[PDB]
Amino acid sequence: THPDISVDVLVIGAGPTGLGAAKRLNQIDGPSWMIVDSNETPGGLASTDVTPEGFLYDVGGHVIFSHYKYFDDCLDEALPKEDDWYTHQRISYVRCQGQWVPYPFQNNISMLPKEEQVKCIDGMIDAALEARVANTKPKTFDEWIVRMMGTGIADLFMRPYNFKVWAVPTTKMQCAWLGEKVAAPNLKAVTTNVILGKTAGNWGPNATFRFPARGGTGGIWIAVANTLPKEKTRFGEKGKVTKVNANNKTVTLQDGTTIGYKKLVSTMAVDFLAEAMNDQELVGLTKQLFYSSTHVIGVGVRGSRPERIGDKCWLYFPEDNCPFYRATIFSNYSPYNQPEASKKLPTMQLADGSRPQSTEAKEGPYWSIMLEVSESSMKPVNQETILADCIQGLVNTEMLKPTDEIVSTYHRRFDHGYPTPTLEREGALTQILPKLQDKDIWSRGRFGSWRYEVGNQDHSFMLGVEAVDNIVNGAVELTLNYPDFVNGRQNTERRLVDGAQVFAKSKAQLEHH
Amino acid sequence: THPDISVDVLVIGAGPTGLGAAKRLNQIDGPSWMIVDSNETPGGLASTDVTPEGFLYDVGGHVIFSHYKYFDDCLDEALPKEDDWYTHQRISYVRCQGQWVPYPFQNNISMLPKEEQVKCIDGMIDAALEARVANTKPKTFDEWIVRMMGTGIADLFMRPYNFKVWAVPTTKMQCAWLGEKVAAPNLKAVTTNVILGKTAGNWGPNATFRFPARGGTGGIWIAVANTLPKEKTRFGEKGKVTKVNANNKTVTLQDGTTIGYKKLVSTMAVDFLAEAMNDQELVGLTKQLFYSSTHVIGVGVRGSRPERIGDKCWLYFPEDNCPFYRATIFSNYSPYNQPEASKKLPTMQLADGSRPQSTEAKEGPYWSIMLEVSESSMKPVNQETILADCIQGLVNTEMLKPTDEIVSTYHRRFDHGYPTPTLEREGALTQILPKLQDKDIWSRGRFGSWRYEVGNQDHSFMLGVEAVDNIVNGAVELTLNYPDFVNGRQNTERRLVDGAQVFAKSKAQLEHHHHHH
Ligand SMILES: Cc1cc2c(cc1C)N(C[C@H](O)[C@H](O)[C@H](O)COP(=O)(O)OP(=O)(O)OC[C@H]1O[C@@H](n3cnc4c(N)ncnc43)[C@H](O)[C@@H]1O)c1[nH]c(=O)[nH]c(=O)c1N2
Ligand SMILES: Cc1cc2c(cc1C)N(C[C@H](O)[C@H](O)[C@H](O)COP(=O)(O)OP(=O)(O)OC[C@H]1O[C@@H](n3cnc4c(N)ncnc43)[C@H](O)[C@@H]1O)c1[nH]c(=O)[nH]c(=O)c1N2
Ligand SMILES: O=c1ccn([C@@H]2O[C@H](COP(=O)(O)OP(=O)(O)O)[C@@H](O)[C@H]2O)c(=O)[nH]1
Ligand SMILES: O=c1ccn([C@@H]2O[C@H](COP(=O)(O)OP(=O)(O)O)[C@@H](O)[C@H]2O)c(=O)[nH]1
């Protein structure tokens, strides 16, 4: 029997990947298409939440730096006003030995204690010499670190930090993923800086970036979904996929509505997708994949931005005097990520945990802190005591004075946080993905295609764009198969207005010869 | 005043590049478009000539091996019948020291004389030992050859050969072009074969290949062209481009016709383009480029295929006992490249140059050899003497016995043969190309983009295809900018029937279900 609805291309999920698919679909305006999502609000893991007090929090804070001109076009289309954005320059430091070491760490050894600087340079020297002779390739992430950083920097930062964020040890991850993620320190550069006492903080695709004035990052994706025809969307309890029948190519929803498709773009976690397909083979395969969970903790504090905090953006915490691995001064991204000074709110408690001097509803201004803590089957965290643990950790790292007035807290656990680049991931994905494509299912996204190298808003978005382009125009999926290619170049060819539209438009008015 | 004709995309040239452009444009069926060529027969350098005796000759004995499904799709549409193609294994040797060394030369040291083998291995060892330690990249082509084969092979084969074909010293060429062209020998593999006396002729994309049954490669591009809407073509005198006005985006033709365009795909020699544009800056930039001319020599000889010839395909001649650098037994590719054994022809002359015993029309069968001689400002050739030179060369190399009966001769000089991969090349192209792209001009092709790495029918064809995909869909031009990426992978995404066509075909199937119902 024929399904309730029938389209050429069905997109499941409405995070960056899903809307990516939809934008290109909408642009081509060829094949019939439909996008569904179990959430009444688009944006997925790039959404913003608001506290009863009025503090916005992303999912661990988010930064926008595009490798793609198409991604830029779409953003400009949803927020065209020039006061819809704020442009920032990256100010990132690392909390080490009681000091703020400018990011990247491996280029600012200069800031460390002399005693430690000697440890690090001794390692880079040993490392640099072996590299001058090596011909083989690093097997594990750990081997990589040791070869590029030396044992010194590895024990002082790399190792302990990488466990803190990945929730797994360095020896158990691959190293084919760290192209533009982990900087390989140059011996000449590093020493020079140690001598002169200068800093190197320009490295990375993070240098400069822009943030949305209003709504957090989630505001972006709401604005993006608004440019799509509503009738082709279906968001909420009515859009939740409960069953996927690959063989007869139909999708059942929560309210039992069935959708027929020729091509499926699926952005949901691939392990859930396997369940929905009731496919025992793919189920075995997807459970070879490993992932960590993410707690996001938000704290709202009264008072003008402290001078010790300054223009700091996101900070790193390798040391063990706090659960979180990274921290963001979310209040610096936009003056609308917390209430205005006039808004009155009662202090809930002080930073040390003691009750506040006065519980009356006082005025701001306020500022905001965002923290991320990882959790996995190798690194457990107590969910009930983590919120306190973080505020304690904020004191231990001198992020907060014991006397600082806390006027808002935020805690949420995202079961699927990071797609872990383990040593088995590829062996498992090179099976899963092609098999799904043989069924005409393009499984894409942070958890759709499970590749951290290219997990990220712009990447995820383009994953959805290129899947549609592959399906329709025979494009090559560069971003999915060749991360180091799309990452090392300016991707400017594909625009929100290509020839195909400019041409059909002059064929409308037309005539002339 | 507006032009006589206007299109969204204008394609100049009906070689493999332009025909590539045309195929994709026809497949998309979106923007209006047109293709012009100054020749009545599509194909360009990939076409075929016939002797008044009935011998076919390509422009160098071309061979079809593809890195793209799209290229395959299009040829299959052109020549669908299965008796339209012959498939051949690559039987290729190098002539050295009176021996036939199997290609690739640097992997078959076994067949050389022992004394020569010694020089070659010694070089590989000294080269291998330095390769183990290198951290820099070779500057010139010569530095590359020494690093990867040693002084031995360098002096015996590479150096002399490469000049003989490029018409320039290796020291003047860059080395970023030889990804899949020049094999880098593996010391362990090489010595092993020297010991065991084994051969290794599987290397290269040339291993296996197919050849058209009829019309030579020329027949392919004729067939492919007949798949295009004729009214959108203009081949011959009426299609020769004389002038290009990049400012008001208009091309002028031989007969005075003017064509307006929104996007220009030019496959003509980029230097000719610069001249046609009357742009002084570009002309100055394109005369920094270098190229070599090619002479093609065709010989039709009477008799059964000599047992000394065998199933050989093409042969390399690094030595100086002959003017040509390469030779193909063109008659092995297809039985239709020469007249049938029952057609009677008079012997023109014997190989040694003497007059034939008899001058009556005798029968076949026949076979055919095709030769290539390179020419340049550093390597002149005497155009009036080259033919006899080649014939004489064939005798010196034992290709023809002085008594062989030559029944047909052929000679043609192509001014633009190879785009030379010189050291100054990229310095010139990295200006020329973007500058032209800023005028909405996609210059693409063997001499359109001037990159040997990515010259070759399938490469040229796809250069034309990805340009259109760039102009219309926003694709990235991979072949043009990233030769080693497209060369080292299977290109299966872009098809002659893409989704777009399927869904437009379903959407009109749905609008038919409501027409009557
Ligand atoms: C902690 C942390 C930190 C960062 C980031 C990630 C994380 C978690 N990101 C990356 C980012 O959040 C990510 O790439 C996108 O959110 C991924 O989009 P996806 O669409 O692939 O998944 P995502 O999860 O976002 O979307 C999936 C969606 O599909 C839906 N869905 C699932 N199952 C469904 C079903 N059965 N039926 C209907 N709908 C269903 C979900 O509800 C949702 O709408 C980021 N990026 C960046 O650029 N800069 C950064 O700094 C960071 N930092
Ligand atoms: C000696 C030799 C040997 C080989 C090969 C070439 C050569 C020279 N090739 C490569 C191959 O022949 C090549 O890549 C294509 O023929 C290049 O086609 P283009 O379109 O780029 O130029 P090409 O010259 O082929 O075509 C361009 C065209 O534009 C036209 N034109 C020029 N000016 C014009 C004007 N003003 N107005 C209109 N039209 C104009 C020309 O007349 C022609 O029709 C090959 N390939 C392969 O894969 N296997 C092989 O074995 C070989 N070997
Ligand atoms: O000072 C630093 C901080 C980060 N890292 C490495 O860089 C990777 C990516 O950092 P990023 O902040 O970009 O990852 P995110 O969590 O934001 O996606 C981490 O896994 C670390 O291994 C580093 O080399 N030096
Ligand atoms: O035995 C051989 C024959 C070829 N060459 C190299 O391969 C290149 C290309 O040869 P090919 O016949 O493939 O070029 P074509 O003329 O067919 O494009 C030449 O420049 C030589 O440097 C080589 O390394 N060994």
Side-chain angles (χ1 to χ4, degrees):
Chain A
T1 179
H2 35 249
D4 299 328
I5 311 179
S6 283
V7 291
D8 299 326
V9 173
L10 174 63
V11 193
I12 302 178
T17 308
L19 303 171
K23 285 297 289 184
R24 165 117 298 207
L25 272 165
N26 200 248
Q27 178 184 187
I28 285 174
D29 190 35
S32 70
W33 64 272
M34 186 184 197
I35 192 179
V36 310
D37 195 87
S38 54
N39 218 285
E40 303 195 359
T41 298
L45 277 180
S47 305
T48 319
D49 288 338
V50 193
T51 62
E53 295 73 60
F55 287 74
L56 293 71
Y57 294 114
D58 285 337
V59 181
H62 293 300
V63 150
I64 311 300
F65 56 104
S66 182
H67 308 81
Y68 309 96
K69 217 58 194 67
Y70 192 88
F71 181 75
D72 299 331
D73 286 352
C74 286
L75 292 200
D76 280 329
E77 181 196 26
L79 308 169
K81 293 153 60 182
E82 61 177 356
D83 59 310
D84 281 334
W85 300 95
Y86 290 127
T87 329
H88 298 297
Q89 180 182 305
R90 184 195 65 207
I91 304 295
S92 187
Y93 298 100
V94 179
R95 188 67 182 176
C96 184
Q97 302 284 176
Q99 301 158 88
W100 293 118
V101 180
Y103 165 91
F105 186 87
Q106 54 275 7
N107 313 338
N108 290 271
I109 314 299
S110 331
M111 245 58 51
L112 297 170
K114 292 183 180 181
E115 190 183 45
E116 302 289 356
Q117 305 182 215
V118 187
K119 285 180 180 293
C120 294
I121 308 289
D122 259 26
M124 289 189 56
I125 289 186
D126 285 330
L129 288 176
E130 292 184 345
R132 179 61 183 79
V133 123
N135 68 329
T136 75
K137 214 171 181 184
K139 317 190 190 75
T140 59
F141 182 15
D142 194 81
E143 294 190 13
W144 187 97
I145 291 179
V146 175
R147 284 197 191 171
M148 246 56 191
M149 314 276 180
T151 300
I153 300 174
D155 283 311
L156 172 57
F157 165 87
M158 276 302 169
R159 287 182 173 102
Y161 177 78
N162 276 273
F163 175 91
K164 204 170 177 193
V165 47
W166 289 115
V168 321
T170 68
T171 65
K172 294 188 170 182
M173 289 178 287
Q174 70 166 44
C175 66
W177 64 268
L178 41 59
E180 68 155 24
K181 299 291 183 177
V182 186
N186 172 255
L187 191 46
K188 278 188 152 200
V190 182
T191 57
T192 299
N193 282 5
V194 168
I195 294 174
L196 298 186
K198 293 285 183 172
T199 59
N202 299 128
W203 193 99
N206 283 317
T208 148
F209 68 95
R210 51 169 172 161
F211 188 92
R214 303 177 180 82
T217 69
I220 291 174
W221 302 116
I222 289 185
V224 175
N226 283 339
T227 62
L228 298 178
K230 292 307 155 53
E231 50 287 2
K232 293 183 174 174
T233 74
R234 207 185 168 98
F235 298 154
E237 186 75 359
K238 49 165 181 172
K240 177 165 186 177
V241 179
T242 57
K243 178 181 171 55
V244 173
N245 199 333
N247 286 131
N248 64 39
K249 279 177 162 183
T250 81
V251 169
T252 306
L253 306 188
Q254 189 74 288
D255 56 43
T257 297
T258 63
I259 301 179
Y261 66 83
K262 303 173 182 179
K263 305 288 176 181
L264 188 66
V265 188
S266 181
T267 71
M268 56 184 297
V270 81
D271 60 343
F272 288 159
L273 173 48
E275 234 63 51
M277 286 179 61
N278 300 271
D279 187 326
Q280 288 292 30
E281 182 174 2
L282 293 173
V283 165
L285 259 27
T286 62
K287 291 202 277 191
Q288 300 184 358
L289 299 179
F290 197 93
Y291 67 89
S292 64
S293 294
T294 304
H295 294 77
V296 177
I297 312 298
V299 170
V301 33
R302 155 176 292 118
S304 301
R305 183 192 69 182
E307 189 179 333
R308 70 193 120 89
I309 271 58
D311 66 332
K312 287 174 169 52
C313 287
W314 60 93
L315 316 181
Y316 303 97
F317 303 86
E319 297 180 351
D320 49 334
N321 62 327
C322 67
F324 55 81
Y325 55 87
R326 180 172 57 160
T328 302
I329 307 305
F330 198 63
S331 38
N332 295 167
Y333 293 175
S334 189
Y336 306 102
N337 297 160
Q338 345 69 34
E340 300 180 2
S342 49
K343 181 71 190 289
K344 292 174 187 169
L345 306 160
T347 301
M348 296 185 166
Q349 72 171 82
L350 300 186
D352 57 26
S354 64
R355 306 168 79 273
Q357 210 78 264
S358 186
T359 66
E360 58 185 337
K362 302 186 284 180
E363 295 180 332
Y366 313 93
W367 57 290
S368 203
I369 300 182
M370 184 125 59
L371 318 173
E372 301 148 75
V373 188
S374 70
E375 165 201 309
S376 74
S377 50
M378 302 185 182
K379 169 190 183 298
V381 334
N382 182 6
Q383 190 177 174
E384 268 84 47
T385 67
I386 186 50
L387 178 51
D389 252 325
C390 288
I391 303 190
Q392 182 54 232
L394 284 174
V395 173
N396 302 140
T397 55
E398 300 178 347
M399 294 285 296
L400 296 170
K401 299 191 174 191
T403 60
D404 282 332
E405 307 187 31
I406 292 180
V407 194
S408 177
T409 60
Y410 174 82
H411 181 18
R412 182 167 167 177
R413 188 186 169 282
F414 301 93
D415 182 85
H416 291 254
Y418 285 55
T420 300
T422 65
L423 289 160
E424 323 83 37
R425 185 195 82 185
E426 285 312 302
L429 287 185
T430 61
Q431 294 203 230
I432 304 166
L433 299 183
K435 281 199 167 63
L436 282 180
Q437 200 156 336
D438 297 336
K439 306 184 186 306
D440 274 330
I441 304 174
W442 282 247
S443 177
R444 302 291 184 271
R446 190 169 176 90
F447 290 97
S449 30
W450 211 280
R451 294 203 174 96
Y452 179 77
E453 308 85 303
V454 99
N456 256 17
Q457 303 189 223
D458 74 312
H459 289 131
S460 294
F461 189 74
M462 292 313 294
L463 283 174
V465 178
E466 302 188 15
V468 169
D469 248 343
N470 183 79
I471 287 166
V472 185
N473 285 122
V476 39
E477 294 180 279
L478 293 172
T479 297
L480 172 68
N481 299 280
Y482 312 105
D484 279 330
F485 180 89
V486 290
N487 278 339
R489 71 189 307 270
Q490 286 183 324
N491 296 288
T492 66
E493 295 87 336
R494 181 182 291 110
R495 305 293 294 271
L496 178 61
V497 170
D498 289 322
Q501 293 79 47
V502 182
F503 289 142
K505 228 134 59 179
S506 83
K507 191 162 193 66
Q509 307 152 2
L510 207 47
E511 277 186 87
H512 232 293
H513 236 66
Chain B
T1 183
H2 45 319
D4 298 322
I5 294 181
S6 290
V7 286
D8 302 318
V9 190
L10 173 67
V11 190
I12 303 175
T17 307
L19 291 174
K23 283 301 300 176
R24 171 120 291 226
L25 284 161
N26 190 235
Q27 184 197 164
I28 302 175
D29 215 24
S32 65
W33 63 273
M34 191 178 186
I35 173 170
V36 306
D37 197 89
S38 47
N39 209 311
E40 301 247 350
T41 292
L45 277 178
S47 35
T48 306
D49 287 348
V50 202
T51 65
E53 297 68 61
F55 286 82
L56 272 63
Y57 291 114
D58 273 11
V59 183
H62 300 233
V63 152
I64 309 300
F65 61 102
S66 168
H67 309 63
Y68 314 83
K69 286 310 279 89
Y70 196 80
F71 184 61
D72 301 316
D73 277 345
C74 294
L75 302 195
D76 282 351
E77 180 188 27
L79 304 167
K81 293 157 62 181
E82 55 172 337
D83 61 289
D84 280 341
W85 299 95
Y86 289 107
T87 314
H88 297 291
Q89 208 174 210
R90 180 195 59 200
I91 313 293
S92 181
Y93 303 87
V94 179
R95 184 72 175 178
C96 183
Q97 301 289 170
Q99 318 281 320
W100 288 121
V101 180
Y103 166 88
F105 185 94
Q106 58 273 22
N107 303 344
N108 295 269
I109 314 306
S110 330
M111 264 51 58
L112 290 181
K114 295 190 174 187
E115 187 188 39
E116 301 297 344
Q117 305 194 198
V118 175
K119 292 161 169 285
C120 281
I121 293 300
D122 263 31
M124 281 196 54
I125 288 171
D126 278 5
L129 286 183
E130 288 191 6
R132 176 64 185 87
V133 119
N135 69 336
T136 70
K137 213 175 181 183
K139 313 186 189 71
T140 64
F141 179 25
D142 189 72
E143 297 188 19
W144 186 96
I145 301 179
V146 170
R147 290 250 203 100
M148 237 66 178
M149 301 162 185
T151 303
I153 299 168
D155 284 323
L156 184 57
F157 165 73
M158 286 291 164
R159 289 193 167 114
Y161 177 68
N162 276 266
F163 171 83
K164 210 177 174 197
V165 61
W166 297 106
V168 294
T170 69
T171 46
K172 287 188 176 185
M173 285 188 280
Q174 80 175 39
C175 72
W177 64 267
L178 47 72
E180 63 169 9
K181 288 291 182 182
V182 185
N186 173 239
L187 187 58
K188 255 190 179 188
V190 171
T191 56
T192 288
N193 283 348
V194 175
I195 290 170
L196 298 178
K198 291 292 180 175
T199 59
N202 303 134
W203 190 91
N206 293 307
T208 165
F209 74 87
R210 46 169 177 164
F211 188 85
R214 305 185 169 84
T217 52
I220 286 184
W221 301 112
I222 284 183
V224 177
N226 293 333
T227 69
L228 297 165
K230 279 213 319 307
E231 40 278 45
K232 301 200 194 188
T233 81
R234 214 188 161 104
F235 304 151
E237 203 80 2
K238 54 171 180 173
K240 182 171 184 177
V241 173
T242 61
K243 178 202 177 74
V244 174
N245 192 326
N247 292 132
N248 42 80
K249 283 184 169 176
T250 56
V251 160
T252 312
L253 298 176
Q254 181 74 326
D255 56 34
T257 307
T258 58
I259 308 181
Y261 62 83
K262 294 199 191 75
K263 302 285 181 178
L264 192 67
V265 184
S266 184
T267 72
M268 49 183 290
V270 73
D271 56 8
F272 281 167
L273 177 60
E275 211 79 48
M277 289 179 60
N278 297 289
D279 187 319
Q280 296 298 1
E281 176 184 8
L282 287 173
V283 170
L285 250 38
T286 62
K287 277 185 295 190
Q288 300 185 25
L289 299 186
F290 193 82
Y291 65 89
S292 69
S293 298
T294 303
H295 289 83
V296 180
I297 311 290
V299 176
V301 38
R302 154 174 289 137
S304 304
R305 184 185 59 172
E307 186 182 343
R308 82 186 98 102
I309 295 310
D311 55 330
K312 291 174 172 57
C313 288
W314 60 90
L315 316 166
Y316 304 97
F317 299 74
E319 292 173 347
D320 63 329
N321 55 328
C322 68
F324 51 79
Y325 63 82
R326 176 164 62 172
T328 297
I329 310 297
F330 198 56
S331 52
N332 278 176
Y333 290 0
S334 170
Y336 302 99
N337 297 167
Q338 339 73 38
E340 298 183 350
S342 54
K343 164 147 185 65
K344 300 186 183 66
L345 295 160
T347 289
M348 293 190 175
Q349 69 166 81
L350 306 180
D352 61 27
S354 80
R355 303 168 59 263
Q357 301 254 19
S358 178
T359 62
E360 60 171 339
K362 300 189 297 178
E363 291 181 327
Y366 313 92
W367 56 299
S368 200
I369 314 185
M370 187 154 46
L371 308 158
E372 296 162 72
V373 180
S374 79
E375 168 196 287
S376 74
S377 70
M378 303 179 185
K379 179 186 180 294
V381 332
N382 191 337
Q383 210 180 131
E384 274 74 49
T385 65
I386 195 53
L387 180 50
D389 218 328
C390 282
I391 293 181
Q392 183 47 229
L394 289 174
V395 166
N396 301 155
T397 54
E398 299 185 354
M399 294 291 300
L400 301 164
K401 299 176 182 185
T403 52
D404 282 328
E405 313 187 10
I406 290 184
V407 181
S408 185
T409 68
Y410 171 83
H411 166 64
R412 188 162 168 186
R413 179 187 175 280
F414 300 93
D415 193 44
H416 292 238
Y418 294 61
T420 307
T422 60
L423 292 158
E424 323 79 5
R425 203 191 67 180
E426 293 308 306
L429 292 186
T430 56
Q431 293 186 269
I432 292 171
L433 292 195
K435 280 186 179 55
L436 288 166
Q437 188 128 348
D438 289 335
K439 299 167 176 298
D440 278 319
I441 304 181
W442 283 248
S443 192
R444 299 287 180 278
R446 185 169 173 96
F447 293 89
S449 24
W450 209 275
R451 303 198 164 121
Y452 180 83
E453 317 88 270
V454 107
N456 261 20
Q457 290 178 221
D458 72 331
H459 285 129
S460 298
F461 191 84
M462 301 303 304
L463 283 171
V465 178
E466 302 166 7
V468 172
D469 249 4
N470 179 251
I471 286 165
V472 175
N473 287 122
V476 36
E477 303 177 76
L478 291 172
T479 308
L480 176 71
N481 299 310
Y482 307 92
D484 285 322
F485 175 84
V486 309
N487 275 340
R489 75 190 301 271
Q490 297 179 343
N491 308 285
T492 66
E493 290 81 349
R494 191 181 286 109
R495 304 304 287 261
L496 180 56
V497 173
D498 280 324
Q501 294 86 77
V502 171
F503 294 152
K505 276 142 39 187
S506 287
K507 190 159 287 293
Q509 237 144 55
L510 274 48
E511 297 176 5
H512 173 71
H513 191 277
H514 299 177
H515 270 149
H516 286 88
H517 297 187

